[model samples]
Target: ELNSIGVTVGDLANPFFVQITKGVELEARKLAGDKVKVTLVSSGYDLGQQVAQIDNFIAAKVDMIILNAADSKGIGPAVKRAKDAGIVVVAVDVAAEGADATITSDNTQAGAMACKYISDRLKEKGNVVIINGPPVSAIQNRVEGCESEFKKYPDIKVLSSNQNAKGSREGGLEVMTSLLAVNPKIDGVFAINDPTAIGADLAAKQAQRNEFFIVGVDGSPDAEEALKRGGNTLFVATPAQDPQVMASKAVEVGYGILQGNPAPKDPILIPVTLIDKNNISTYKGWT
Candidate 1:
């Protein structure tokens, strides 16, 4: 029913966002059935670029725009401008300060789920480290969620609470190597995403500290492959954020707007599931 839509994300090169984009495209195509047009844009983690992209969409007069903000607060003006132009805006993956709706994983729950797995594997007693990404609301929520679970176990000491790894595999490797040097007795690690987790796993293996358990969010293909191999991998578990479902929902919301319905203001918190060796077979390889 819609004529066209626009979607913007942090970075398309990142597998996580790639999957999310694919979902948005596939669902939009299905729903529009040759009638709806979807445009994909990438901000590469730049707030200014994202704002510019939104402005371009507005100039082109798209029916709706889907955003995965680079920064929570930095996107406020862009969101406001879109609203002022009467464009329906849907925030995807991460929330923007002002938007019609948000569709993303419950980051708090994701963090709790990752840490719970680690806690259970370690028997709730061990030295743990948390490797986090940039200081964003979503990342903070994940840390809080994991911390909430870790607080229950007095014996579980968090040796390193805040280590910025730049949210990449290389970043993870660098941070974990340093952490290991400082605290070699670390029993477990919770990375913000799969790339960081994989980096930590590789670092642990190289350091010959195979006794530790490592986990992260974002059930990317790399993580799944590592889980399949079954040893000395930091990515023991991840929460699968199904891009297909998210994309479909984005299209639905966009279509709803085309039909003159008020876009939902409430955020859509997608559920994530634990992915580990035991049930890794059930999930399809990340696309």
Candidate 2:
């Protein structure tokens, strides 16, 4: 029987990660009984720290680990070490090499759809900005998907796509401010996630610029309320991710592996849907 489980996420401060942890905890208890131990840690997007955390988990002899890799490819060796130690390692929110199983939203599709909205809104011709995030596979996929979509609209020029927002609201605000100061004709924005989209809107507001609309991933609760508030808000749309479901599934997948069941070879991708002004009223949101 599984006695304990460990979790390490990119950053615990983000509500998205917090929700994932909560989901994991809830699911672990339900599957492993109330006495099961669940240890949670934050990587702060530091690969060294994450590797150390995994080392700790290995030393503690946890039955399983639910990881959100700080650096997708960089975390490979640690994941392999964990599996060698007989601990099932399941990756969430981002893909980690050598992980037994991985589960995340279809970020590429989300990014494509979000950017497509921007492209359509701009009438196929305008300058756009992509507020990027950390170098994790999830963020990279989103940016790549956005770039692919923007490519179809030849008139839609992506002014900047390399600015790293560090996947935080403050980073978004600072990066958006810097971008606004440099690019005067930005007609659209595609933030990597909701927090960045919100921060970008705040930056635009502080700069007194309202000519552009923004789209993002993770139809987070804050994004839901922002859309509901709805006055002069350029934070128009977001593709929602279901963290609770994602995390719960991660635990179940890990449990299956622990029981000698063959884990699915391919990473599991949960589909996402775009939430915009037209559907915000009905979009239940990330709960």
Candidate 3:
């Protein structure tokens, strides 16, 4: 019986991850009733702790696990142990190494869409900067997507590629502020995720530079606020990855597979939509 489940993501303060957790819990309870047991943990990006959490989940005999892997390759043996125990592992946000299956945003597409908007707005020629985040596969894939699209415009140069923002608003602000201090004129900025985008926005506002396209991933409430704020907004577009639906699908897929249904592809990509002022109202935003 698929009555027990485990999810390990970062802080609940991150609405992006919070909604996913809620979606999983709500969907699980709907199927299994009040007797369903769900365990949520925050790994804070600690590789050892992440593995430990999976080990603990195994000890408790969870039927399945939904994880945003901190160190995909580094966490292999732990995942192997879980698999040996016959527990279904579903990797979310970032692909987990050795996971039975993975459900994540089509990160390459998300970055392509966001950067395409920036490139089009810039007329395919500008000095662009990508304000980045943690060293996860998710961030790596988005960069891969963003840069791949930028190739269409050989004129647009990517300045400063590997600065880590920790994917937090504070980290975003700090790294962006530093970048702004060094670069006198930045034509465009692509933040890998919403919190980084929000932080980049704050840094831009503080730096008093105007007239550049800023895009990010995760159509979060903060991104919505950035889009709504009036006049000549730099924070222009974001690729909204539907966290709730992804979570629901992960739970549903996990449940269905346990019931003797065939497993889907190894890496199942959930599509994302690009949200900007033009379609902000039509977009419900990730709740």
Candidate 4:
């Protein structure tokens, strides 16, 4: 019955995904009473692995499945299969096509906000670089947001637009180092997520380039800690998508499905926030 819930994410080792999993587990414990079980599986950014994970979930006959797809489009078959098997499928953080419900941050708005913050601080005249994550829909939405905001500024030049970071700190360092080899005088940077921004900051430190500003999405605790320490790295803004909240909400939706109630028709859009030095102190650590 409602004994078990399966969660599949892009990567369990990622701090962001880890937080989400924790949230899911905590919420499931609270909602499933004493007998509820939570099973977590990682796809490691592999679509094949995700598909296999879904198949396993279906075979296990779990009551519900929470999916953070590795790729937005490639998850359709898995989602369809899970739904056809009479399992409740909920999309968390990143979207998966054909899921019963989706909970995620407004990634496009988050990206635009980060870029706009930098643009406003620069007074619309400076060179900026966009260090992006993989070609996932979430990253693409953030890029689109940045691109749209940049269109409003005629003088602000985008020095580089490239996808080289794997949404990690090291990925950011490698990509930024390469970008610096060509254009070392960049005024600001908008990384797709926090790890990439931190990586870029590390690269900047290594290259002795401290004058530029670095911003990113994903309001991770690590980013907030870096800001609190007065580091060169800063996140302009991030859309805080609490995996805990998403997981709790997904459980509620799943329970409703088991009871034959209709799932929410509208997708849930979590809010993002701007984190800067001005209010970094008040920010709480992610749970």
What ranges in model 3 sit over 4 Å off? 29-35, 43-56, 70-75, 154-162, 165-185, 230-233, 261-265
TM-score of the candidate numbered 3?
Answer: 0.81
Compared with the true structure, what per-residue lDDT tens digits does model 4 show for residues 1-287?
Answer: 57888999887887767777777777677776767788999998889999999999999999899898888789899899999999999888877889888887778888889899889989999999999889877799999999999989999999888767999999999999998888957888999988899889889888888767888787788677677775445444544546566667767777777779887787776667787777677765464
The 10-residue segment with the lowest total lDDT in model 3: 228-237
In model 4, which regions exceed 4 Å deviation? 1-3, 10-14, 25-35, 42-61, 70-78, 178-185, 230-239, 256-267
For model 3, how does the per-residue alpha-carbon lDDT over 177-281 read when each residue is reduced to its tens digit?
998988887899999998898888888888887757689898889889888887545788899898887887788888887787777766888899999889998
Q: Write the per-residue lDDT of candidate 1 for residues 1-287, one digit (tens) a residue.
A: 46778888887777777777777777777776666677888898999899899999999888788888888789999889988997888888777888887788888999999898888888989999999888876788889999999998888999886888888989999999999889969888999888888889888888888768888887878788788884545567887777667766876776677678876767777888888888898887556
Comparing 1 and 3 on lDDT, the stronger one: 3
The list of candidate 2 runs beyond 4 A from truth reads: 1-3, 10-14, 29-37, 41-61, 70-78, 95-97, 123-125, 154-157, 164-185, 264-266, 282-287
Clashes of each: 0, 0, 0, 1
Query: What is candidate 4's local distance difference test score?
Result: 0.82
User: Using alpha carbons, what is the TM-score of model 1?
Assistant: 0.85
lDDT (Cα, tens digit) per residue for candidate 2, span 1-116: 78999999987878788889888988998897789899999998999999999999999999999999988899999999999999999999878989999998988988898999
User: What are the models' TM-scores?
Assistant: 0.85, 0.78, 0.81, 0.79
Which ten residues in a row are the worst by lDDT in model 2? Answer: 278-287
